[PDB]
Design a binder for these strands. Structure first.
Ligand SMILES: [Mg+2]
Ligand SMILES: [Mg+2]
Ligand SMILES: [Mg+2]
Ligand SMILES: [Mg+2]
Ligand SMILES: [Mg+2]
Ligand SMILES: [Mg+2]
Ligand SMILES: [Mg+2]
Ligand SMILES: [Mg+2]
Ligand SMILES: [Mg+2]
Ligand SMILES: [Mg+2]
Ligand SMILES: [Mg+2]
Ligand SMILES: [Mg+2]
Ligand SMILES: [Mg+2]
Ligand SMILES: [Mg+2]
Ligand SMILES: [Mg+2]
Ligand SMILES: [Mg+2]
Ligand SMILES: [Mg+2]
Ligand SMILES: [Mg+2]
Ligand SMILES: [Zn+2]
Lengths: 115, 108, 219, 152, 300
RNA sequence: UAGGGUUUACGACCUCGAUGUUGGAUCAGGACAUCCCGAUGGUGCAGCCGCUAUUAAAGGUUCGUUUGUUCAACGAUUAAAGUCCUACGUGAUCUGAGUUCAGACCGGAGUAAUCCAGGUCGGUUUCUAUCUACUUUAUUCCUCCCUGUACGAAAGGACAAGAGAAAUAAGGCCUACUUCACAAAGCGCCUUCCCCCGUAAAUGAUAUCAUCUCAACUUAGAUACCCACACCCAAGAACAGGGUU
RNA sequence: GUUCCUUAAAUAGGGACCUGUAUGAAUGGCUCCACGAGGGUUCAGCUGUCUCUUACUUUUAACCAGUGAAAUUGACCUGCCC
């Protein structure tokens, strides 16, 4: 459940999430009719004082049974079309995002580990 | 809140004279086979209960007079015997509580 | 005998026919799979049949924290720190998938729920994913690997210092002080241990469950 | 809401409730008869059931010893509970004690009841004797049962 | 004075009377078992514009149920205890049919009900939920309604008394947001606000206010059945059923548009084990329900 | 030429033996001078995007900052963050961030006190319900074959129908997730069943053509809930309701 | 107010300018190491204030027994719309 103003942990190989900052990258708004957001939903993340898009890749709270549950709010950056920003994802990605195979195809191919 | 007008004796009666507040007539009163002081269903008689309470009071008084001070309660049962009545050969180890008077018409 | 804790029913006041049907369904399901003996803290290896994944058979390893639920709702959370990050999946012991449920190491620990591993360093949770199992010898007692687990600094997520949980597996001498220990003991409730009216006698129920299991196996 | 909620309220909390329960159990083990409100009466009866069960489990057991020591502050009553009330009921299973309601008190007019272990030595309370077997309805039922037996 | 059957009986007649009552009830049930062996009335075929009789089961509990697609689906358990027809009244709108449910002792019942149940060869029941039916389907009273009336792959509507919450407030009875807890609440943490404007010197009927929540009859529409048991007489209804465990519920057919003509393969009157029908297995499964004892599914 | 007093003003009809005031929180009832989902004409309408007119109250009208603000500015959205009355709705439901008070300053007027339709610091928000009134009666975004078709020169890109997951509100449950523990719940799951009057077209007279008709006419045009002592309860303040084989 | 930073979003806060025509040097003006329940902003941690609340203990709450009243009351057989 990544809502507004949530210290999200970025996991990418770009110069945005890896660069240091005097503030943690907090969320902005969830691209959904409700304030709650699960895996697969897009979210706007603030990094270095900007407002770049992102994508929820697992949440801290446990949703259904089969899906996993991470200890941190893992999130991978993304652009308008997406078109991911990073180049390598070391952390494991859940197998729930593989149900699209159209909206986020490059994100799955760039990922290395999988649950 | 504050009453805008004064209630009437009629409204007062209608409020207090309703069957809800009126005491309901109970039909759980029955005659006891013994003594005879109209007991109540599912409830013990008053005279018999008072007699049993007095008997227990006397028994406790005698036990305290025998045991002496507090912090006793031995690890053996008890047997209440009144005047006479030779102790039975079964209750040999059970300490006897010598009681006065004769046995009543309900102790067995 | 062992008898899994998922077969014994709750202390509710429902119809025994529901529990009987649930036990029959669980036995019919186990007739295909296996579901061997395992306690809390044992390293397992579930192989689910996920569709959207590189290959139908999807394996995963982790330590069993707690096993809640009854009947077909029997589940168990497997924790395992892989690539630094911690993952926790809830596998149900009665699903149409799940090809095999291998066991790597049979353990028991001291607490019946290892929910305190979240607020602990990853050293006590990082385990290899491709490690061979270990034999428990020809029928041997359950080894209780008694060991103290170091916890993270004071900022926790459930306050494991209070005695309401009764863990007895967290080294409080290397993390907490005397004032914190006293403040935690202040919340103690000695009247809960000597409350005989709270226990749940499950002797005749366990005997009936074992008799039903034996009757089903005989058929 | 209190659906399926057991254990009623008594004192200023669970601690006071269990303390009053232990005090009543000790007083009963001492005198074998106490007048208490119906709620506390049934609570003490249910607690004494498990107390007798524990006492029957065994004396050498450490758990039973600790339970008796915690539920009997008088100390002198633990030997009695272990060596008088345990063997005397070695033939029964779980049916012990006896519940009988008291009419009313004299001040607050409370619904009190009586408690006492079966047997004992105190005088017997006036139990609710059922109708005799030589009455009209009883004789009719006996005749009906005799006819049914003769039929088969 | 108020008397009861367990008053003027000795300790030697109570168990005798109990055994007599039990034997009489068992004999009555055994006699009422076989329906077709007496007078099952003319059995008409199925028609487009017509309905059938429902059931009155006992909500045991809830259990999960999976499908071949690999998804979780909540499923309830409704035990069809006894369930027999009481009477039948024709045309003031449509034909009706009285159906019984769980068995009840014949001691704490009224005199009129006792006489009505003595006129028929069945014991007294708890609830009596009358259903609506047409003139085509008409079964003689007293016949048994087993759990095999419904079949897998059908939508069934269930209605019963919900778990009453008592004279609850507003946040629980209606889900109001209520006032906060600070800035600057002092006496308001779960109370409501205004009622109906200010000029309105009264309160509009139907205004949400504190009251008794639950304990009312509510119907559910769009609950599919996945399995039916013939031995223990159990129904597998998807979703939740209003009520508590071991609670009598009213079962019948759905009224949805898409689920109104699929009653061709289903029995028009009721299930008659006396066949001329061939007994059914332990339980009938659906096409998408994963049966127990089968190998692990695979999407390959 | 006709309708309103939403704003600023005119008189002070009851209120100075008291209508307690602006905002904020929840709660909403009604109206269209309607943002849309529903249905149409025109168009400087080739299709998506645009504008005007007729009907529609079954619904909603987001998340936050500065700001006491009702007002005003800014970031992400959505078909959308509309207006008005309800004592400029609601203080016997709640707070006072200013406004009506006692203390001290900042700039000015004033010998002085004192004052500012100029600003700031903080500034007791009381009531045991007497009566009226009340206390359980549907929808939508997105995606897919249609289709990258019709349209269109090219970009760009339609209605309609079917299928799958999600979003407000309403009715239920603890067996799977969570607070938990012989319960109750949500963070979890199921269901939500038929229109809405303005126009589009034949035959036909006043007015033999033609004419959709405030002429006679032909097409788009409610079903389900509920109804025979004493102990315990998933029913509950008592009462009432269910069970006591 | 001009302008930079501080929030992705700033009549809030800090840094340099005065058409301050009514600031201003014992009506004392500007800096300054300590300190103020004086007035504001803010970086790492948070607490159900909220998103969306529930379960539990006590007082309170409901019935049984009694002492037992305030403010207030023109009488009331005490409804809705126009
Ligand atoms: Mg936490
Ligand atoms: Mg009390
Ligand atoms: Mg709240
Ligand atoms: Mg308060
Ligand atoms: Mg106050
Ligand atoms: Mg005035
Ligand atoms: Mg006046
Ligand atoms: Mg006044
Ligand atoms: Mg209009
Ligand atoms: Mg106002
Ligand atoms: Mg008012
Ligand atoms: Mg102050
Ligand atoms: Mg107030
Ligand atoms: Mg009243
Ligand atoms: Mg009035
Ligand atoms: Mg602020
Ligand atoms: Mg000072
Ligand atoms: Mg009183
Ligand atoms: Zn008597």
């Amino acid at each position: 459940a990544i809502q507004k103003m949530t210290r999200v942990r970025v996991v990418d190989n770009s110069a945005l999430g890896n660069s240091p900052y005097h503030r943690a990258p907090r969320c902005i708004h969830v691209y959904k009719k409700n304030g709650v957001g699960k895996v697969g939903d897009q979210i706007l993340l603030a990094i270095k004082g900007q407002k770049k898009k992102a994508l929820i890749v697992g949440h801290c709270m446990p949703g259904p049974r089969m899906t996993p549950r991470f200890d941190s709010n893992n999130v991978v950056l993304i652009e308008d079309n997406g078109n991911p920003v990073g180049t390598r994802i070391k952390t494991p990605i859940p197998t729930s995002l593989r149900k699209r195979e159209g909206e986020y195809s490059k994100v799955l191919a760039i990922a290395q580990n999988f649950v | 809140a504050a009453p805008k007008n004064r209630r009437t004796i009629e409204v007062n009666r209608c409020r207090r004279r309703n069957p809800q507040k009126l005491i309901k007539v109970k039909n759980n009163i029955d005659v006891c086979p013994e003594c005879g002081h109209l007991k109540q269903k599912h409830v013990l008689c008053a005279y018999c209960y008072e007699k049993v309470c007095k008997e227990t009071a006397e028994i406790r008084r005698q036990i305290g007079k025998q045991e002496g001070g507090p912090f006793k309660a031995p690890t053996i049962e008890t047997v209440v015997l009144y005047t006479g009545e030779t102790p039975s050969e079964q209750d040999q180890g059970k300490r006897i509580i010598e009681r006065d008077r004769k046995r009543p018409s309900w102790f067995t | 005998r062992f008898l899994s804790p998922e077969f014994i029913p709750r202390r509710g006041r429902t119809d025994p026919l529901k529990f009987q049907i649930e036990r029959k369904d669980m036995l019919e399901r186990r007739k295909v799979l296996h579901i061997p003996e395992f306690y809390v803290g044992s390293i397992l290896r579930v192989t689910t049949a996920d569709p959207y994944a590189s290959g139908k058979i999807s394996q995963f390893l982790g330590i069993c924290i707690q096993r809640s639920g009854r009947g077909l709702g029997a589940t168990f959370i497997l924790r395992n720190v892989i690539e630094g990050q911690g993952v926790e999946i809830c596998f149900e012991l009665y699903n149409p998938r799940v090809q095999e449920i291998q066991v790597v190491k049979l353990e028991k620990r001291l607490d019946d729920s290892l929910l305190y591993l979240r607020d602990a360093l990853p050293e006590y949770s990082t385990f290899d994913v491709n490690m061979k199992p270990v034999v428990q010898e020809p029928n041997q007692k359950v080894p209780v690997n008694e060991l103290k687990v170091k916890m993270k600094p004071k900022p926790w997520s459930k306050r494991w210092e209070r005695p309401n949980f009764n863990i007895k597996g967290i080294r409080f001498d290397l993390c907490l002080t005397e004032q914190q220990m006293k403040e935690a003991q202040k919340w103690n409730q000695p009247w809960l241990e000597f409350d005989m009216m709270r226990e749940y006698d499950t002797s005749k129920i366990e005997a009936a469950i074992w008799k039903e299991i034996e009757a089903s196996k005989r058929s | 809401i209190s659906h399926g909620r057991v254990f009623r309220r008594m004192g200023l909390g669970p601690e006071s409730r269990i303390h009053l329960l232990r005090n009543l159990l000790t007083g009963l083990v001492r005198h074998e008869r106490i007048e208490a409100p119906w709620a506390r009466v049934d609570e003490m009866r249910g607690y004494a059931e498990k107390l007798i069960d524990y006492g029957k489990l065994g004396d050498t057991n450490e758990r039973a010893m600790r339970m008796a020591d915690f539920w009997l502050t008088e100390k002198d009553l633990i030997p009695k509970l272990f060596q008088v009330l345990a063997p005397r009921y070695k033939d029964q299973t779980g049916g012990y004690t006896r519940m009988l309601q008291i009419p009313n008190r004299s001040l607050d007019r409370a619904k009190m009841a009586v408690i006492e272990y079966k047997g004992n030595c105190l005088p017997p309370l006036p139990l609710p004797r059922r109708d005799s077997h030589l009455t009209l309805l009883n004789q009719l039922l006996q005749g009906l049962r005799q006819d049914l037996r003769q039929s088969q | 004075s108020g008397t009861w059957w367990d008053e003027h009986l000795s300790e030697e007649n109570v168990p005798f009377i109990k055994q007599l009552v039990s034997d009489e009830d068992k004999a009555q049930l055994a006699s009422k078992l076989c329906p077709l062996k007496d007078e099952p009335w003319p059995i008409h075929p199925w028609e487009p514009g017509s309905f059938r009789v429902g059931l009155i089961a006992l909500k045991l509990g809830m259990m999960p149920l999976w499908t071949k697609d690999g998804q979780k689906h909540v499923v309830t358990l409704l035990q069809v205890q006894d369930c027999h027809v009481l009477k039948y009244t024709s045309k003031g709108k449509m034909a009706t049919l009285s159906v019984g449910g769980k068995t009840v002792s014949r001691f704490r019942k009224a005199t009129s009900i006792l006489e009505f149940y003595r006129e028929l060869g069945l014991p007294p029941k708890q609830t009596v939920k009358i259903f609506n039916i047409t003139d085509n389907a008409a079964i003689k009273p007293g016949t048994p309604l087993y759990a095999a009336h419904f079949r897998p792959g059908q939508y069934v509507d269930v209605t019963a008394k919900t778990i009453g919450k008592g004279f609850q407030g507003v946040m629980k009875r209606w889900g109001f947001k209520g006032q906060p807890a600070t800035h600057g609440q002092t006496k308001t943490h779960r109370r409501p606000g205004a009622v109906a404007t200010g000029d309105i010197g009264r309160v509009w009927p139907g205004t949400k206010m504190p009251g008794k929540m639950g304990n009312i009859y509510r119907t559910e529409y769009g609950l599919k059945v996945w399995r039916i048991n013939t031995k223990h007489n159990i129904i597998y209804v998807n979703g939740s059923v209003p009520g508590h465990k071991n609670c009598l519920v009213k079962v019948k057919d759905s009224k949805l548009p898409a689920y109104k003509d699929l009653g061709k393969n289903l029995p028009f009157p009721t299930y008659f084990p006396d066949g001329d029908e061939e007994e059914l297995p332990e339980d009938l499964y659906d096409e998408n329900v994963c049966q127990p004892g089968a190998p692990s599914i695979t999407f390959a």
